Ligand binder design. Structure first.
Ligand SMILES: Cc1ccc(C(=O)Nc2cc(CCCN(C)C)cc(C(F)(F)F)c2)cc1Nc1ncccc1-c1ccncn1
Length: 290
């Protein structure tokens, strides 16, 4: 791709390193570290996530982070794709990529923490279920990720590692697709022939759906991921319905796991379908609408 070579609109993206208050670490990789920070005037004060290139990084590592920055800029804006807010690329400090901060963390861990705080739907008095998750929340998250993937697809992208661990949750129940840089999430064609396409991302989306409606459980419980797993997968064996799913959502997972990639729904069809399911669920209770 050589994305690092793309023109850089510094007036639009460059942020002064001295306008950042660096905080607690959020993660680390071969590239360096990601830390939480407060930025002033990146749009006031706003909390952000900063991916920083380690000192003494190799040329390939440096090139890789710059590439990621240019790719994020190329992709463009979408509510459900982690928002790039700026970068620090000029001399005087490390290369830094700045994104919005999602306070609730990854979806897998978050959902897991709400297992004792979930009900299919609230009933008045609703304060008995304050901050509880409901089927509406779960369908909503599913819908948003589909919207985000439909967007990435429209921009000719292939995610390749779609999973709950790569989805962050921000305020107002808005989720963001990320790629922090996965056999249980791979389509058969990917496992056996290393083939990656938007349709294999759909298969992974199906696993993500299972993760969502199991409230953060690990895929394929009780199964060792080995040649026997691959044999049975290719044969048609699929995960059973998760504990918090609806019949419609489970069939959607099955659809996403069709053996033939061309027969799996497209993200556009998933957006349509999940949107309808969400609307039906959101307007179902007429209690407050007399
Ligand atoms: C700072 C930063 C920079 C870039 C990204 C990120 O997802 N980048 C990225 C990069 C790419 C292309 C490059 C992929 N490489 C494998 C890295 C695609 C996406 C897409 F489209 F899938 F969303 C996303 C996440 C983050 N955020 C982050 N990273 C590591 C740990 C924790 C966070 C975090 C915590 C809370 N709030 C926001 N970010």
């Amino acid at each position: 791709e050589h994305a690092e070579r793309l023109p850089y609109d510094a007036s639009k993206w460059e942020f002064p390193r001295d306008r950042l208050k660096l905080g607690k670490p959020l993660g680390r990789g071969a590239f360096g570290q990601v830390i939480e920070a407060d930025a002033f005037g990146i749009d006031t004060c706003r909390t952000v996530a900063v991916k920083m290139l380690k000192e003494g990084a190799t040329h390939s590592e440096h090139r890789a982070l710059m590439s990621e920055l240019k790719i994020l800029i190329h992709i463009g804006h979408h509510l459900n794709v982690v928002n790039l807010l700026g970068a620090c690329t000029k001399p005087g400090g490390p290369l830094m990529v700045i994104t919005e901060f999602c306070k609730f963390g990854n979806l897998s861990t978050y959902l897991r923490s709400k297992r004792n705080e979930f009900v299919p739907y609230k009933v008045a008095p609703e304060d008995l279920y304050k901050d509880f998750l409901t089927l509406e929340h779960l369908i909503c998250y599913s819908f948003q990720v589909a919207k985000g993937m439909e967007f990435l697809a429209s921009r000719k992208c292939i995610h390749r590692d779609l999973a709950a661990r790569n989805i962050l949750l921000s305020e107002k129940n808005v989720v963001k697709i990320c790629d922090f840089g996965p056999l249980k999430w791979m389509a058969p064609e990917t496992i056996f022939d290393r083939v990656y396409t938007i349709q294999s991302d759909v298969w992974s989306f199906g696993v993500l759906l299972w993760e969502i409606f199991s409230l953060g459980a690990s895929p394929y419980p009780g199964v060792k991921i080995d040649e026997e797993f691959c044999r049975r997968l290719k044969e048609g064996t699929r995960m059973r319905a998760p504990d918090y799913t609806t019949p419609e959502m489970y069939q959607t997972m099955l659809d996403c796991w069709h053996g033939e990639p061309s027969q799996r729904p497209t993200f556009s069809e998933l957006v349509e379908h999940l949107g309808n399911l969400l609307q039906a669920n959101a307007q179902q209770d007429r209690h407050h609408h007399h």
